[PDB]
A paper describes a structure:
The final reconstruction reached a resolution of 2.2 Å, with local resolutions ranging from 1.82 to 35 Å. The ClorDNAV capsid has T = 3 symmetry and consists of 180 CP protomers. The asymmetric unit contains three quasi-equivalent CP subunits, designated A, B, and C, following the nomenclature previously established for CtenDNAV-II. We were able to model residues 46/47 to 388 of the 390-residue CP. The three CP subunits are nearly identical and adopt a canonical jelly-roll fold composed of eight β-strands arranged into two antiparallel β-sheets (BIDG and CHEF). A third β-sheet, composed of seven antiparallel strands formed by loop extensions between strands C-D (2x), E-F (2x), and G-H (3x), creates a surface-exposed projection domain. As a result, ClorDNAV contains two interior-facing helices per subunit, whereas CtenDNAV-II contains only one, and only from subunit C. In ClorDNAV, no such density was observed, and positively charged arginine, lysine, or histidine residues within the interface region either face outward (e.g., R80 of ClorDNAV) or are positioned much further apart than in CtenDNAV-II.
One major group, the Bacilladnaviridae family of single-stranded DNA viruses, infects diatoms in marine environments. The icosahedral capsid of bacilladnaviruses is formed by T = 3 asymmetrical units, in contrast to the smaller T = 1 capsids found in other Cressdnaviricota groups, presumably reflecting the need to package larger genomes.
Numbering used by the authors:
A (entry chain A), E (entry chain A): 46 to 388
B (entry chain C), C (entry chain B), D (entry chain B): 47 to 388
Write the structure that this text describes.
């Protein structure tokens, strides 16, 4: 049937079954989908202070809108965020429908970084307010030569604590300056949960060699029950959002109890999905004799949205027909807690 | 009888039962009311706001109490001159649903609200959880064969969910009664509706006004579970505003306050889509052409869970889940056509 | 496999499994705890508030940690004299659930809260998502056969959903311990309970106190997806309040603040209904006649999704969806009878 | 799977799918858009060109973006007085297709073109290959029943294929907007249309204007492979021309230049035929009798192959060949009747 | 049936069949289980005296409670235990239910290292006294690059001689200082049995290359007969326990004939299981031109316990139902003496 391609994309995020996947449950009567993808080379960094004497690169793949991947202790992170935000780098989906634009609220002039405490406005540029994740996957390949392919990795999926300050907003293209913004997992989660986490005790935890990580594939799991959409609400902020104050330009709620913090958390995250945390114990990188482990990151976030009539995409929307196999497809998918499976 | 419930679900004006429900077993004890109103509507002769324009703009939204807003209406021109797009509203007065505005400190009922003084929007329905079983609109042109020209175009759409797109106004369509309901805000036309490319929306249709009596407009639900809407307590000051004139149409001052989002959530069944209609009517200039006369028949079938303090709580019955509910919903919403035959 | 889960769903006190679930596959990885408590309750001898009254008022609510509130109990009269309707609370101390009040600036645990100074209600469970698999109360008249007179009446109702109808108090029923849960507020009796004509409510039943040992009260879930509740971070200054006395029962200071709605949403499983019970007991004069003594047995089967930091995360198991879940829920909630044969 | 595609093929206004295709597997990766427009058209009141004439001449052509040209319409009389036969154009503004006139040396967009200075007609779609899945026109007499008199006649014909029979004008029907499409040139009426004895043409039909609401005009494709059209880069100086007036209707200055043939080939899907319609309307004297007012509804379902630079490239889907394509096309084109029952 | 997951964990210690495995024989009427796991990077050390001129790392995986793995001649062992206790390192299960706490008996104040000869008390902190091993496995992966993956290994399982001084107590987390204690195989076993053992003569002995050890999986074998639980008895000691006197803080019975020695041996070891001894003939490590072989150790000990009513875990206990396939599952498992099998 026609739902076969949708189910295939549901269980295999990188599947080539269809360019316009859907969750065939009939929730979004008329909707369109985009397969957001990005491929980036990532290398563990040589940090002077924050990750001094550490060859561990920390990866969080989260169901956030636009910037699902956060990497701490990457060379790009050390370059772009020196000593700030855990020297992290972000992989997002620039030049694709989703995203926001920061404006000065009083005048409407786009502005990045935000000039807080002055009033700001995150303008939703996607032409949609309801969105959900069909499936989200990450593929990591060790791109070093055979004489430098040493190291290992550990990974586990987990139930996120839903703390507003665990998510942040950063440019979709991974820079610190472009005013096309997405929602990313905050590096603050690493130093409050991630670094101290007892990974081995999490169900589904797995480990392996970096030279074999190219055979692994990490994907988030949805619920077996109906996958409710996330509603993007209007968002304006003054001092209710904050950053480290440095050139990293990673902004997150100033606290966890304000109404803005909860609104930001709810609108920026698909809370039907789980999170995955990966530690890459890489080849050392000191810049003189060891130059770290270079990786190939391939992240795909399949998203279904309901476009509003003002959008030019509203003409392309198609009908979402409910299928009888959707629930059992999802249950079969999420009945295995293994953090990764073979490609 | 699940068959009668399904019949009402797919045909809002069906007479299968007087107590329809969504037979999914979500609300354990509940009671439903089929809110209805019949109103005559004519495109207005506005001096400035719609000067020279023969288009009457109709929005049918899944709001509690006042589903229909009509801009460039003769009633709108008379009641709300030069304000709120000279709109008129069709609601459900004298039926259980509704609110009453009070001055919060003293408790004195007060309409229009005395902003910035603290106000309270008291829920008078005796319920806090509500949902829409089905909503329908029927329009008939009431002109003679010598005056029955014109055409219409309509489409359903996914609403952008902006708090200022909804407003609160008297249920009976007046500006003073103080039996308030939630309506689509005429400000939606100024920002989305007027400049909207209707022809590009899926399910868009057009037709002649003389043939609109054979059409029927209904909102479409989701195929999945139809979650109910919760009415929260509502007190406000400067967080709500209006045009400041005698139109007495009030709405959130901005789109970002907590009150704005609470108002949006509680006033709208966000499981249902919206429909927009443009009526290209006979000109109404006041001297040589006197417009198109319409009969509007709007029905909103609502299911609520009454609280024990209500004088309707004793009449609640059980909601029994039926197997065919999802199939009925999917069959209903699989066709995006804005209207069908009656 | 899922038969034990269904058994616990329909029978809260069933011995089928120590780790029940709602087998719908909603929480992929989750663990469950069967929160239970057995207490002895007798009607009190109030000097002023319930002076001369022989009625104990019991509310069974789907609140996290302290589901039962008893007004005009001996323990209520002793611990909370002339305050909060001299009510007692039955909670689940020493088990996983609960909060801890802190001074926000320093993090030092502190009970009672030092209003209006900034307080933080730290969630001490390792979970943020929780839902009630099933909740039930058993009441046993422990009086001698010679003193078995009296009668009771009960009803289930759709809850007002007002923030001030819920409160926070120590889990162990005291006023001093800094392990806090969420309880139905005795203010609900003042506003709704006392003035309710219970006999009119659907599913209302009455019986003799000597036959209450054969009855079982249990809340009714929905037939649709039992969506979980999210515990949000909570910090309060003047947004919470109390009677000002030593009863230390704290609740939102109004029904409209952001904290009020957050508290109400996070503390209550809104997929369940509430139960109100009136116990008409033997009089308690304090010296010679000690009224009626009961055995209260309340069980709240809760499913939670533990976060990584929790030591319980290692024990979580996979929730597999079962085909009979909807049928079981609908069969359970299709009967509005407030109690069924034990 | 392909049933929806066949439905759109035989019924241009069908609601089967928002992304139709010709399922022949010609374009491996492609996306489709259903270009539609609904306009009100009434016969004009010309001072000189159509002075005293009640006939509107309508050409439905397979031109990219502006398929319909109406001569002697009120809008034509207003926008293009005494020029280009006082014609109106119905195009598809704001949708993907269209061009932009530039000054060739600087690249600055400029409309009208500054002949004889070098101009460039930049293709603003992200595609170079395009073909028409199906094209149809619906005409509705919007006059009152009292004023429903008049008749119409129509025929389909094999097109001359002369470059000056096509022109470029703004997509939105204006004379000033710099979003350009390809339209049938009103010069074709002067050379062919006006002097045509329509009654002799095969498939010719006539009817009453009051019954045109029951008719549907659609172009007929071939039964063989529907080969796509290629949009070539186009730069022109004196090779294009206009009447010299404010109507801004531009067409090749002769029929033999390389640019003339390139323009003709790239702007027209030559696998389709054309349709000529004569509407004999009520007279329009400009003050008391306003002639006949129609509702024009034209849909052009187009399949394109987007190039990598386009943002639409990500949305392209695989065109799978179907066994029923040839049968569907042959069944469609085997009937030369100019219109069929709506 | 439901016993399928239990049998799967019985035969595959790293199986993801269930998070709460059991031995479905109906011995422990009401019980709860924990899957104790730890993942540690291990490298053969460069010792100056004890393992001078030796590239052999000695691994013993024993059915001891909490610290099943002992590695001699590891870099961590050379660092933490210089010249003492065979320069060994231990992989245990910290932060998981099992373990002990050392106290001064007279005052009850926790104290590590013990201040012997003064009276000490090993306080059982698990909330249980009856325990048994469902299954125990070890996975070793060579984490060197392809230009440093030289070496080989040999392994054999054996029947332990049950000498009390062959086991010891050491912190669960592998340090020498944390007061959360477990039971480990004593390095003294190596110099009395292990170093001189004729490994090739033991049935089931196998050998291979270090670059292929990642395909091997070592697991202990239980008896085919009923798996009796081990009872943890109260334990207090003065001079009946001893160490080398150095900063290694590895403590073991002072002799083999005291009542305390036998009690320690019986309570700390599941004597229904066999032992495995592995020799890793690693790449040389001299600190100037060869830096040894780096490994990834992944050890899992699946344990079933009966919690006492004072424990908070007593509420979570489930019923142990006897299954008809348990005996044949165990017999099929232990009928092959091969020291390792493919993963």
């Amino acid at each position: 049937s026609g739902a076969a391609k949708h189910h295939a994309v549901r269980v295999k995020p990188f599947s080539n079954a269809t360019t316009q996947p859907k969750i065939p449950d009939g929730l979004l009567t008329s909707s369109l989908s985009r397969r957001l993808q990005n491929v980036v080379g990532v290398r563990n960094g040589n940090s002077p202070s924050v990750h001094a004497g550490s060859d561990v690169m920390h990866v969080v793949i989260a169901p956030t809108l636009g910037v699902p991947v956060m990497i701490a202790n990457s060379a790009e992170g050390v370059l772009k965020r020196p000593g700030l935000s855990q020297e992290s780098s972000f992989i997002g989906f620039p030049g694709q429908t989703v995203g926001f634009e920061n404006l000065i609220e009083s005048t409407g002039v786009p502005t990045w970084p935000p000039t807080i405490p002055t009033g700001q406005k995150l303008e939703n540029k996607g032409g949609f307010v309801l969105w959900r994740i069909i499936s989200q996957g990450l593929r990591i390949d060790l791109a070093n030569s055979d004489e430098e392919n040493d190291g290992w990795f550990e990974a586990c999926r987990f139930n996120w604590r839903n703390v507003p300050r665990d998510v942040c907003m950063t440019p979709l293209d991974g820079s610190t300056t472009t005013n096309s913004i997405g929602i990313a997992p905050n590096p603050l989660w690493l130093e409050e949960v991630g670094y101290g986490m007892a990974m081995v005790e999490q169900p589904g935890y797995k480990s392996g060699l970096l030279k074999d990580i190219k055979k692994a594939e990490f994907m988030l799991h949805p619920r077996t029950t109906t996958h409710d959409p996330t509603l993007i609400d209007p968002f304006e902020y003054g001092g209710s959002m904050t950053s480290s104050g440095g050139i990293d330009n990673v902004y997150y709620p100033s606290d966890n109890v304000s109404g803005n913090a909860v609104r930001f958390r709810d609108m920026g995250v698909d809370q039907n999905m789980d999170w995955i945390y990966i530690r890459l114990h890489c080849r050392p990188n000191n810049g003189t004799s060891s130059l770290g482990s270079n990786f190939l990151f391939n992240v795909i976030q399949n998203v279904e949205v309901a476009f509003n009539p003002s959008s030019d995409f509203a003409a392309f929307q198609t009908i979402n027909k409910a299928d009888t196999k959707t629930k059992m497809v999802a249950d079969g998918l999420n009945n295995n807690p293994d953090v990764f499976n073979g490609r």
